[PDB]
């Protein structure tokens, strides 16, 4: 048997319903989502980190000339100058006065700290949604992970539940993301091969251990000071460090809908947007005959206490007269009031107490008891606390 | 210098273009697409056998 239902996407708050066959006792269903995660299609593109100015020993030739040999290291710069008069601790390295030549060749290499400190680039799109559900259909309670796309049902006791796709394809992430130290930021980094000096992406590497890197640090060699063997070099500061000092606030606190971010793998969860539809396929063996369940007669409502707060604040005493003692489900067909419990145990000639939540000053709602209906009515009082520490359990009717 | 052109997708045929600047002699360019690959982005689900 095919049944359709809808669920506002939000964890914690439970959901109660009864499927009512025209000639058999209603079958109860309870649903509780635990975690609703949303994982994107994310493909890694590159990685960056601190760089280190690789500088060999200066190549000095004394009264002669030299040439440049390109090692083809990334962003290599080579230069030769004349008219050098170097010194050493033990006097003069040379005796020549002029014609001396010195050659400098400089480059960049990845810092030793690349493994533990490195910012990753990511291209995100195509969010897929997963969920953990705690569902009980006909006192068959289960906790299970389910693919809530438009296929992939999960079956237990013959009951086949299918959670359809979301009504909204919104995602908190932008197309290009940057990851670092477990924090996530939506940033527009320049793409591979187009890095610029003094900004993010000056040094470029396909992977952590690619061993082939592109670089634009704009390294410039300079004439060393006279009477000293050394090589002065000038370059823009680390754009990674400039971005480190800039660091706009994190997505964990900037995202709308209050979406929390964890990255063991990149994912976002526990934030309410849209609705998830549920499709039940129930086998015909789970339906029980009416005579095998208690049936009531002359049942009446009374409203004992009212507080139309966020939490359940309506207490109702229902007085009944039963042919049998046995548990049955109680349901409110409309959204006027939402009950707290999925089932209530029932004596022969006792009275039942029911907790519910409503936002109506003058509620008048029809409850469905084991096989009959009763019409509870009354007025209700405002709350006392201005703010609470939990969300709303009910809807806001117009 | 910015230049734009189009190449009909097919392999085995050389394609010719010329970059024509006003103040310099035209520069010819010849491009041959040796192999064009269509890589789907794919996932695994399960395996089966006897």
């Amino acid at each position, epitope marked *: 048997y095919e049944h359709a239902t809808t669920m506002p996407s939000q964890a914690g708050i439970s959901y109660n319903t009864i499927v009512n066959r025209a000639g058999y006792a209603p079958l109860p269903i309870s649903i509780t989502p635990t975690k609703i995660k949303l*994982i*994107p*299609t*994310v*493909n*890694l593109e590159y990685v960056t980190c601190h760089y280190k100015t690789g500088m060999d020993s200066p190549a000095i030739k004394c009264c002669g000339s030299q040439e440049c040999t390109p090692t083809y290291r990334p962003d290599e710069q080579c230069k030769v100058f004349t008219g050098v008069y170097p010194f050493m601790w033990g006097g003069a390295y040379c005796f020549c006065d002029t014609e001396n030549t010195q050659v400098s060749k400089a480059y960049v290499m990845k810092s030793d700290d690349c493994l533990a400190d490195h910012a990753e680039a990511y291209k995100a799109h195509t969010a*897929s949604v997963q969920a953990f559900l705690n569902i009980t259909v006909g006192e068959h309670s289960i906790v299970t992970t389910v693919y809530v796309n438009g296929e992939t049902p999960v079956n237990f006791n013959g009951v086949k539940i299918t959670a359809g796709p979301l009504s909204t394809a919104w995602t908190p992430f932008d197309r290009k993301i940057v990851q670092y130290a477990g924090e996530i930021y939506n940033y527009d980094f320049p793409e591979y091969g187009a890095g610029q000096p003094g900004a993010f992406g000056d040094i470029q590497s396909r*992977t952590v*251990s690619s061993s082939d890197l592109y670089a634009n640090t704009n390294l410039v060699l300079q004439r060393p000071k006279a009477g000293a063997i050394h090589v002065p070099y000038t370059q823009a500061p680390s754009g990674f460090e400039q971005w480190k000092k800039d660091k706009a606030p994190s997505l964990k606190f900037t995202a709308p809908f209050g979406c929390e971010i964890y990255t063991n*793998p990149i994912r976002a969860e526990n934030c309410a947007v849209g609705s998830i539809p549920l499709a039940f396929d129930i086998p015909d063996a789970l339906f029980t005959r009416v005579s095998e369940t208690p049936t009531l007669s002359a049942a009446e409502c009374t409203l004992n206490e009212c507080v139309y707060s966020s939490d359940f604040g309506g207490i109702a005493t229902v007085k009944y007269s039963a042919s049998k003692s046995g548990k049955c489900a109680v349901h409110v067909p409309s959204g006027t009031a939402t009950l707290k419990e999925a089932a209530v145990e029932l004596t022969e000639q006792g009275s039942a107490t029911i907790h519910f939540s409503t936002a109506n000053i003058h509620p008048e709602f029809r409850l469905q008891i084991c096989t009959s209906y009763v019409t509870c009515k009354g007025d209700c009082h405002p709350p006392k606390d201005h703010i609470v520490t939990h969300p709303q359990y009910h809807a806001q009717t117009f | 210098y910015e230049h734009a052109t189009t190449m009909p997708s097919q392999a085995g045929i050389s394609y010719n273009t010329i970059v024509n600047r006003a103040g310099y002699a035209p520069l010819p360019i010849s491009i041959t697409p040796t192999k064009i690959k269509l*890589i789907p*982005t*794919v*996932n*695994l689900e399960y*395996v089966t056998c006897h």
Partner: nanobody, 122 residues
Framework: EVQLQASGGGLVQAGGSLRLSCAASGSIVSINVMAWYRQSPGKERELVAKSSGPFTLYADSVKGRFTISNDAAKNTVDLQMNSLKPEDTAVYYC?????????????????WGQGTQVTVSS
């Protein structure tokens, strides 16, 4: 992205015994297949070893001499290579197929490492 890193090889005399290792890095949790292929100069690509879980398979010209072991926990394969003949010189590549990304953005199926050179001297 997922990659394969190959280590081992070198120049040795005939009759020696070496080990070739290939390791997988990236966003992977389980691997369905890992195999070895050899490419000699002037010829085409051929298979040598074939390991996946407990089962193993060997070619006609490699039986009884080379042994393949796989470690899915480390996602590595070790080809213990013995009884060298002059025809065994080639560049060896390690291949991985049926990759199950850990959701794990689905991506390319197969991968190919750079490989290692094995040369044998009479």
């Amino acid at each position: 992205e997922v990659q394969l890193q190959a280590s081992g090889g070198g120049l040795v005399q005939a009759g020696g015994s070496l080990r070739l290792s290939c390791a997988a890095s990236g966003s992977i949790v389980s691997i369905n297949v890992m195999a070895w292929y050899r490419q000699s100069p002037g010829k085409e690509r051929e298979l040598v070893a074939k390991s996946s879980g407990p089962f193993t398979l060997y070619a006609d010209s490699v039986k009884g001499r080379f042994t393949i072991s796989n470690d899915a926990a480390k996602n590595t394969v070790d080809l213990q290579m013995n009884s060298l003949k002059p025809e065994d010189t080639a560049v060896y590549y390690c291949n991985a197929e049926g990759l199950r990304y850990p959701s794990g953005t689905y991506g390319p199926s197969a991968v190919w490492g750079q490989g290692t050179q094995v040369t044998v001297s009479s």
